[PDB]
Ligand binder design. Structure first.
Ligand code: ATP
Ligand code: ATP
Ligand code: ADP
Ligand code: MG
Ligand code: MG
Lengths: 384, 90, 192, 279, 184, 51
């Protein structure tokens, strides 16, 4: 286990032949030395004799306690499950490295002495915020942007996959990325494509669910979000609809607007605190960009600012090609009449027409979609 | 428009639809032969589908307060005039 | 009969709650309000028979596993038992024939026949909005559709007696999904 | 020789006996009880007990050391007992309540008329109401009308104040709930009256204090125990409050509370009837 | 359907047992027999009747009409399963088994009623099936098959009030208790 | 005394239980006889209308 990290010839050289035949000697000499221990000092099996000596030391009732401090000369103050805490001693088979204050431990039943530590069963909010599998199709599903698709790879993907281009330039990659535009133009859609591609752990939270009902519970949730993001890996934090922290007021929140503010001051810390940050990228998305605090959008916390426009009439035709790809489209229809139906129909409007027109076919058990399906589709989707 | 897949409107019931709600709810009442529920459903000018059980459960109280064991057709028309009175209250 | 004068002098057995097992024939059991205990199992008990979140018997002198104690409740079951939705069916629907046809195309069909949309190549729908004046049967129609295709009809109201079965604090609402993806063909319902 | 040991086994029942409560049985002759020390146990039986005297929620007897089933008991509660009926009626007649023509008539139809004339509700089939919730502004005869019902009744009347379930010790309260309805079961076709449910049934909770974790377990008992009825027992629950805002709609579901009575404030027509009765 | 079906059973009594009165009863029953697709219940009633030598073309136009309703079930059972409702194969012929109860004998009824008895999850269709089992149990005088399903009827009414399913039911024991000599 | 609340903090949960015990022992199901009560306040603005 981690015996030798050197592989660098990568050929049929004598050096790769010599190095591993050196390691062949260090292994067998280690083997033949430790072989002579049980030959001259048998004295136990060592497979279970020292084990059953431990297993007869620690009792069959094994109470679970909780650390709260450590004094280094193998005794520490531990909390029982009731609340009455003790000052027991700590053993030597206890591998004194995984002991943090608050970690679950194993005590004795008689003298409550610290026998072992316990693996934590975590967590019912880490698994809430951690995206398990890749969501959907690739960047080829998007179509039409082609300018900001380059921009997001520039800040997130290319820093991860090619960490050579920045070093030869002697530079650090840009920190923050915000995505803004009219509603339904594909802000959330592009973040799915990043979650498709990347190898980093991907964390997602809506901006609406940052606000809480108890005092101080809001800023506590932000402090433990970036705790989780740092303690895994290179990671991506995606915050969606962050204008919703300020626009809507809810009566569940006990503090008024001056509790929203204290939540935003904690988030304003976590992006550009004085603590050593690490490898955590932040992606943010909104549609009301003029509402939120400009202290949060300054360079240093967010570097790249990406605007999404409404789809153009030659890029609209690309979108109809995408969402009507795998459907049995009857040749009655002409897509160009559907393009300029609304002068400013979003990309979300196109998928809303294409799905609803398919639902009109299943009312009549058909398999192909005719023209009058789309004729009564836009009456149903758009005009109400 | 991409968010909600289908929106469904529920109208208040008309004369043909106020009738069968009475028909399904009157299954567990003890009825008297010869009632003409069609006349009863026309007395309610479309309240909702919730006052129908508001009437038919209360029609048993009229037959109980005069100690009967069968619900008669004059108990319902006595019951409509009380439930639609609270329609005329606020 | 004479043995009962002697055997009843034996002390009682504790009852517990298995969280989950680990290596070398040991499990993790909590007692009433008493702390979590790491105990061993007896020879007459299989490990894979020990379900997580299942009661057991437990001796008290050595805390040895005794016998599996059955099936207490699901917390999803106790949640619906608190709310007591008025269980309905199609046979008590009065004059809503066109809405039943609409609600089946969105919910009933993409369970019994998910292949039928791949033949059209459109995404299967997810969300339904019902509207109209109050008292026109929004709840009974939604309860019936879950009843007739074997769905776990879950309604959330944002209460706090409900709260102790979802989680201890539930800083999100999204912790509801852990019970929901365990009763996989489920339906979430929300009031006004 | 068998009859010698047949009586010999009952030495275990002698004096120093503790009290638990039956929960269920695994099998023949072995069961699960919960002690009044709070902790549950997996216990053995004594064979002379008729098993078919068990489980509504049966108060049992347990050995003080070996802790197994010993004996089944007549029911019991400390709070309250049974409204001692001699010097306990608050002697208000119906005639003292002037100008309450709707509500005196309508509380009759849900409380004591299904108490006596039970079969008409069975024969017509109109599903008699399980409990009733009465409310309104303070000083409208909420407590007064309950006095007059408890004077002209023929059934047992159980009268509790709804701020006494919060005992100091843990588990006392949920025991205090479940033996009220057990006492309303064993005694009679009785009537439960609970006042100031705002002391128990609120909306917001907080699972960090302990004083609020207990109250959460208070409500889940009576919400459970009102579901343990089967239309056959004549146990009616009258409940009166001052603020209907601060109540959980989990408590107002059909099956638990279907009848709601407001006591509006009288204006002129019911006003002059009050002046006649008082003066 | 089984709703005009008891008058047939009285008219078969009107045919045979009045011995001299055997002419207008074999006319008006045949007025109902060789229409409305009746095939099975009258072969021996033809043997109790006269010759009626050419009934073969009278049968062939009706056993074909038996098949035409039979094959449109056979043209329904594959379209109702491709896009399934609530087992619309069964749900179609849960109404058309009572036709096949009238047209065929009990066998096409008994395997399709017990089929659709496991279909519906509310008793409002179940308990109407049981009334159909009772009414054929009177024609073939199945005095042992009525003993089962009457309890299986009566076990269903208690949830709900179901007085049109109870007061109608009291008529069926009333005509059965007077069929047997039990007048009190 | 207080008024009541729409239940802001967790402290005044169990004060209103202490308050509703007081209101019942005055005039609920008891001949409140020979027991007189005298109360004083600087401002009665913050008192429960049930009191
Ligand atoms: N340019 C586009 N190319 C392909 N699909 C698109 C495009 N724009 C929108 N869509 C479709 O619209 C749907 C919704 O897009 P998305 O929600 O990402 O827009 P949005 O701006 O994030 O919405 P909101 O403003 O509500 O957050 C997506 O499922 C996507 O399929
Ligand atoms: N006919 C009447 N109607 C209403 N109130 C009356 C009548 N006769 C007397 N009262 C007065 O109303 C007072 C209040 O009685 P009661 O306590 O039942 O009211 P309440 O609604 O319970 O008020 P609270 O809930 O605040 O105690 C009685 O003390 C009595 O003095
Ligand atoms: N169309 C209907 N058919 C039968 N009963 C109905 C109908 N509409 C309402 N009800 C009655 O209304 C009650 C259900 O309330 P509901 O109307 O579903 O609430 P909502 O206002 O949310 O729709 C049931 O008790 C039911 O008896
Ligand atoms: Mg979006
Ligand atoms: Mg009062």
């Amino acid at each position: 286990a981690s015996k030798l990290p050197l592989v660098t010839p990568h050929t049929q050289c004598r050096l790769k032949l010599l190095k591993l035949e050196r390691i062949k000697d260090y292994l067998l000499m280690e083997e033949e030395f430790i072989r002579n221990q049980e030959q001259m000092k048998p004295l136990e099996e060592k497979q279970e004799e020292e084990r059953s000596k431990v297993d007869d030391l620690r009792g069959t009732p094994m109470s679970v306690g909780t650390l709260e401090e450590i004094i280094d000369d193998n005794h520490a103050i531990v909390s029982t499950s009731v609340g009455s805490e003790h000052y027991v001693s700590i053993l030597s088979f206890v591998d004194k490295d995984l002991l943090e204050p608050g970690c679950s431990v194993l005590l004795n039943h008689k003298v409550h002495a610290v026998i072992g530590v316990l693996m934590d069963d975590t967590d019912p909010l880490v698994t809430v915020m951690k995206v398990e599998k890749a969501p959907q199709e690739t960047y080829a599903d998007i179509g039409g942007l082609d300018n900001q698709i380059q921009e997001i790879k520039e800040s997130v993907e290319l820093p991860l996959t090619h960490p050579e281009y920045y070093e030869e330039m002697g530079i650090k990659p840009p920190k923050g990325v915000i995505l803004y535009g009219p509603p339904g133009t594909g802000k959330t859609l592009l973040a799915k494509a990043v979650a498709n591609q990347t190898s980093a752990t991907f964390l997602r939270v809506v901006g609406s669910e940052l606000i809480q009902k108890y005092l101080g519970d809001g800023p506590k949730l932000v402090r433990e979000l970036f705790r989780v993001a740092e303690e895994h890996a290179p990671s991506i934090v995606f915050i969606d609809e962050i204008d919703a922290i300020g626009t809507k007021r809810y009566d569940s929140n006990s503090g008024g607007e001056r509790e929203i503010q204290r939540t935003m001051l904690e988030l304003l810390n976590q992006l550009d605190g004085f603590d050593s940050r690490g490898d955590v990228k932040v992606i943010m998305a909104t549609n009301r960009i003029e509402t939120l605090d400009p202290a949060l959008i300054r360079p240093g916390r967010i570097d790249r600012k990406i605007e999404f426009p409404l789809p153009d009439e030659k890029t609209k035709k690309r979108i109809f090609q995408i969402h009507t790809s795998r459907m049995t489209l009857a040749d009655d229809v002409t897509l160009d009449d559907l393009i300029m139906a609304k002068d400013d129909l979003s990309g979300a409007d196109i998928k809303a027409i294409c799905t609803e027109a398919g639902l009109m076919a299943l009312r009549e058990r058909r398999m192909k979609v005719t023209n009058e399906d789309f004729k009564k589709s836009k009456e149903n989707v758009l005009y109400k | 428009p991409g968010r909600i897949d289908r929106k469904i409107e529920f109208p208040p019931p008309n004369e043909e639809a106020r009738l069968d709600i009475l028909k399904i709810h009157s299954r567990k009442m003890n009825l008297t032969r010869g009632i003409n529920l069609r006349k009863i459903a026309e007395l309610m000018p479309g309240a909702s589908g919730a006052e129908v059980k508001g009437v038919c459960t209360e029609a048993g109280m009229y037959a109980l307060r005069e100690r009967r064991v069968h619900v008669t057709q004059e108990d319902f028309e006595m019951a409509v005039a009380k439930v639609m009175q609270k329609d005329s209250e606020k | 009969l004479r043995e009962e004068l002697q055997l009843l002098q034996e002390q009682g057995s504790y009852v517990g709650e298995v969280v989950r097992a680990m290596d070398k024939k040991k499990v993790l059991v909590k007692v009433h309000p008493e702390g979590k205990f790491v105990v061993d199992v007896d020879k007459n008990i299989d490990i894979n028979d020990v379900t997580p979140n299942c009661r057991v018997a437990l001796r008290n002198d050595s805390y040895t596993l005794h016998k599996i104690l059955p099936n207490k409740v699901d917390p999803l079951v106790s949640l619906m038992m608190v709310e007591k939705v008025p269980d309905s069916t199609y046979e008590m629907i009065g004059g809503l024939d066109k809405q039943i046809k609409e609600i089946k195309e969105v919910i009933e069909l993409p369970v019994k026949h998910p292949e039928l949309f791949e033949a059209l190549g459109i995404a299967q729908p997810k969300g339904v909005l019902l509207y109209g004046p109050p008292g026109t049967g929004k709840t009974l129609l939604a309860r019936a559709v879950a009843h007739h295709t074997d769905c776990t009809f879950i309604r959330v109201s944002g209460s706090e007696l409900v709260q102790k079965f979802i989680g201890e604090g539930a800083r999100m609402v999204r912790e509801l999904f852990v019970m929901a993806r365990e009763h996989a063909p489920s339906i979430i319902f929300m009031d006004e | 020789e068998f009859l010698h040991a047949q009586e010999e086994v009952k030495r275990i029942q002698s004096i120093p006996l503790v009290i638990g409560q039956f929960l269920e049985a695994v099998d023949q002759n072995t069961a699960i009880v919960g002690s009044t020390t709070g902790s549950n146990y997996y216990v053995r039986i004594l064979s002379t007990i008729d098993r078919e005297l068990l489980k509504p929620n049966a108060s049992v007897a347990l050995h003080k050391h070996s802790n197994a089933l010993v004996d089944v008991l007549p029911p019991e509660a400390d709070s309250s007992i049974m409204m001692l009926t001699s010097d306990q009626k608050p002697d208000v007649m119906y005639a003292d309540i002037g100008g309450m023509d709707i509500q005196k008539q309508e509380v009759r139809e849900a409380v004591e008329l299904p108490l006596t004339h039970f079969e008409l509700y069975k024969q017509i089939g109109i599903d008699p109401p399980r409990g009733v919730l009465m409310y309104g502004p303070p000083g409208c005869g909420k407590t007064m009308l309950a006095k007059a019902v408890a004077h002209h009744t023929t059934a047992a009347f159980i009268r509790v104040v709804g701020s006494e379930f919060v005992q100091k010790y843990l588990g006392e309260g949920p025991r205090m709930v479940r033996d009220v309805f057990r006492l309303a079961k064993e005694n009679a076709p009785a009537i439960i009256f609970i006042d100031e449910i705002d002391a128990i049934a609120t909306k917001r909770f907080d699972a960090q204090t302990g004083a609020d974790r207990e109250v959460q377990r208070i409500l889940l008992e009576l919400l459970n125990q009102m579901d343990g009825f089967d239309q056959n027992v004549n146990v009616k629950v009258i409940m009166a409050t001052n603020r209907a805002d601060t109540l959980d709609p989990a408590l107002l579901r059909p099956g638990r509370l279907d009848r709601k009575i407001e006591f509006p404030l009288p204006d002129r027509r019911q006003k002059r009837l009050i002046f006649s009765t008082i003066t | 359907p089984k709703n005009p079906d008891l008058r047939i059973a009285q008219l078969r009594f009107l045919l045979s047992l009045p011995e001299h009165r055997g002419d207008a009863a074999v006319r008006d029953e045949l007025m109902a027999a060789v229409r409305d697709n009746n095939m099975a219940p009258y072969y021996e009633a033809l043997c109790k009747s006269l010759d009626w030598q050419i009934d073969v073309d009278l049968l062939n136009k009706m056993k074909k009409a038996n098949e035409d309703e039979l094959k449109r079930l056979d043209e329904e059972l594959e379209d109702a399963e491709k896009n399934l409702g609530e087992s619309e194969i069964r749900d179609a012929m849960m109404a058309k088994a009572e036709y096949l109860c009238r047209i065929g004998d009990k066998e096409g009824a008994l395997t399709a009623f017990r089929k659709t008895y496991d279909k519906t999850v509310a008793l409002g269709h179940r308990l109407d099936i049981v009334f159909y089992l009772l009414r054929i149990g009177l024609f073939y005088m199945d005095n042992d098959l009525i003993t089962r399903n009457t309890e299986k009827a009566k076990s269903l009414i208690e949830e709900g009030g179901d007085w049109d399913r109870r007061n109608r039911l009291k008529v069926y024991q009333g005509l059965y208790c007077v069929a047997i000599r039990d007048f009190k | 005394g207080g008024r009541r609340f729409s239940e802001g903090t967790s402290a005044d949960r169990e004060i209103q239980r202490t308050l509703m015990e007081l209101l019942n022992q005055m005039d609920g199901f008891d001949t409140l006889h020979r027991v007189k009560m005298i109360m004083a306040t600087n401002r009665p603005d913050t008192l429960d209308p049930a009191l």
